[PDB]
Structure 1
Amino acid sequence: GSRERLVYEVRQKCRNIEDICISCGSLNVTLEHPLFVGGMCQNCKNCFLECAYQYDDDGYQSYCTICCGGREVLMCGNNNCCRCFCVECVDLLVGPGAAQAAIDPWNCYMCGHKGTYGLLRRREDWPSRLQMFF
């Protein structure tokens, strides 16, 4: 329950989101997350690299953009994107109830006009950051 407790501490202004891995909750941050404000640990970086741009038979990405896992997911309707975000990450980082409110069509957090969704904030330079990340 480390990720949940740490996100709660972020909300209570007792912790900077840059100091936690937003994917798994590890405090062993080794880089800035390339897509969102917040940290990332080296294990999650490796997972992100290995899971990036793998696709299920429905044509959408296999693995949640944030935690690299997921079962029930929100799926981006932008065909140039095709990303998925699991309901657990959305309820944690956007906030309680956000996932079931996000369920037409749906542009994901990387594609929408707004970049701030609760504690989830899209990085300005994310396309170029991905180039450096990969």
Structure 2
Amino acid sequence: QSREQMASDVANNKSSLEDGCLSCGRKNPVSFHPLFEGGLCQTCRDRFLELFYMYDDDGYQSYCTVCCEGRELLLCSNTSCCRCFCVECLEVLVGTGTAAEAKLQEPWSCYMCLPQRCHGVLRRRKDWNVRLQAFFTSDTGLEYEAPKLYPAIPAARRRPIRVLSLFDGIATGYLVLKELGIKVGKYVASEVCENIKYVNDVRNITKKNIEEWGPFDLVIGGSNVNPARKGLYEGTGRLFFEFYHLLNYSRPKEGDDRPFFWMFENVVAMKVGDKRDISRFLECNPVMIDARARYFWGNLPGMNRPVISVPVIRHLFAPLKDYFACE
């Protein structure tokens, strides 16, 4: 069916807006549009999971906020709201190009700023800040078990922590552990090339080195004009698999019940096939945290609790105080 057919039906008020693809007009939707009132088709929802969170170097939205396909973008003059809208969306979902005709005459505020009003067959849904959150980090074709919770330890038998790291920032995980007053005293750093025991070229670390330098108690990792748009065209395969290999090396053997925590970090703007691969290999599901949206895999205690990027890492690492000795 054509996009005008759905608008005609809505103007007749003879159907619901969740019967076709709001971005393409194709029927048989698979999910719901998290912002407006409409359905999402199968091929039109995969593109929404990648490009919806992409900002260019200008600080403005890269693609359309409705169809995520940009050919001629009109801008939101209001600051702290960098949304941009398409050129045919404003003529099909509003009714005509009258808004476009009046768009360039004066500075314009987008549809996410002005008080809610049904500007035709396009209705800003009342609540979006929650179902948008539930749209991304849920509704996936995998289901795993909750991680095993280690029992807490009394402070009379607490020892300093031992950290192996592979973050982008060499010392990013060192300062955070110092602001919390946790007993540092073992720290090995590295990087993916092309008390801190810095060693470059992670290609040089062997199993025997992990055996001698260990045992470890926390393994972390995950890390130029357009750092946000070059990510899709480059790929993140190299960064994940060396972290996975070293996590396999350092993981406690069978019959050992000592605590062991890990965490992986990645940005949201990535292809739909990589998230499934990481979830399958790591045997868990991510939780998004908004400060720059980011995914987080791991087994740290209380990882999906509500918020009460140094602050984000501090929030994530806070519940570690009751396992390892402080000060």
Both structures adopt the same fold (TM-score exceeding 0.5): yes
2:111 to 103, 109, 117: 109
| 1:81-120 pair list within 5 angstroms | 81-97=81-97, 98-103=99-104, 104-120=106-122
Q: Which structure 1 residue ranges, 5 or more long, are not aligned?
A: none
CA deviation profile, 1:77-114 (whole Å, cap 9, x unmatched): 23322111112001000111222223333221112113
Query: Under a length normalisation based on structure 1, what TM-score does the superposition of the two structures give?
Result: 0.86
* Equivalent residue pairs, number: 134
Letter in 2 for 1:110: M
Shift of residue 29, structure 1, vs aligned partner: 1.0
SS of structure 1 residue aligned to 2:50: helix
Letter in 2 for 1:130: L
CA deviation profile, 1:1-58 (whole Å, cap 9, x unmatched): 7223332333244543221111111212122211111111132221111111212344
Alignment RMSD: 1.9
| 1:1-134 pair list within 5 angstroms | 2-97=2-97, 98-103=99-104, 104-134=106-136
Q: Distance in 2 between matches of 1:4 and 1:51?
A: 26
Q: Distance in 2 between matches of 1:122 and 1:49?
A: 20
Shift of the 42–80 alpha-carbon distance from structure 1 to 2, 3 Å rule, reads farther
Q: Distance in 2 between matches of 1:7 and 1:129?
A: 24
Letter in 1 for 2:114: G
Q: Distance in 2 between matches of 1:101 and 1:11?
A: 23
Q: Distance in 2 between matches of 1:128 and 1:115?
A: 20
- Where relative contact order (Cα < 8 A, 6+ residues apart) is larger, the structure is 1
SS of structure 1 residue aligned to 2:47: helix
Aligned sequence identity (%):
57
CA deviation profile, 1:58-89 (whole Å, cap 9, x unmatched): 43211111111122222112332211111200
SS of structure 2 residue aligned to 1:126: coil
Larger Rg: 2
